[PDB]
């Protein structure tokens, strides 16, 4: 199966314009055509979609992922640059939680004061 | 005591410019005048600022974020105004916090791939 950006879009809760947006990036550099030349994603597009999302959502530069995502497909020989980027992004995330918690506390507060 | 837009964005670990941008947006209605007659933040306006930045580093709308402020400005006859809008936040927030836990657990499932051999 080769999903098109439509369908992509619904899956995501995202329009055909913001997909269209990231392939225009060169977020997608991994796309084929189907035989009505189609850009599609196939099973493997579609996880690579959702780290493209994840890593977009949790604040990683969009050059970054593009990095990312050439070293995917350049095969196992980035296995460790991926790796540490990957535990990187785990250590950034956490802090963005620790932060956004902090942050949710002076808004309590403030709930509290009001 | 007063403190300069410099002093602040150190203590704020924001660049001179980024604190600029704020004031160009109109944030800061409430800086004081020094004997020179610079603006500068007294410790009102740093509690100001303090939530500036907590409501922008959750995502809340520049635009939202200025109706806070003259909202508050007005005085406490916009009390359940401001009262919903944090609420609103407070919900916003919980959600992202959710949303970030959901992509955690994505980039973790990843590094367990990853460390395949």
Redesign the interface.
């Known amino acids: 199966m080769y999903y098109t950006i439509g369908q992509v879009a619904k899956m995501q809760h995202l329009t055909i314009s913001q997909i269209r947006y990231y392939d225009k990036q060169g977020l997608f550099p991994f796309l084929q055509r189907n035989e009505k030349g189609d850009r599609i994603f196939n099973e493997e597009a579609l996880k690579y979609l ?2 493209i999302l ?2 977009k ?2 604040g990683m530069p969009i050059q970054k992922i593009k990095q990312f995502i050439d070293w995917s497909m350049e095969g196992d020989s980035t ?1 460790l640059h ?2 540490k980027l ?2 990187q ?2 250590a950034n ?2 802090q ?2 620790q ?3 902090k ?2 506390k ?3 507060q ?2 509290a004061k ?1």
């Open positions: 959702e780290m994840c890593l959502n949790t296995i991926r790796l990957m535990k992004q785990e995330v956490l963005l939680i932060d956004t918690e942050n949710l002076k808004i309590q403030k709930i009001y």
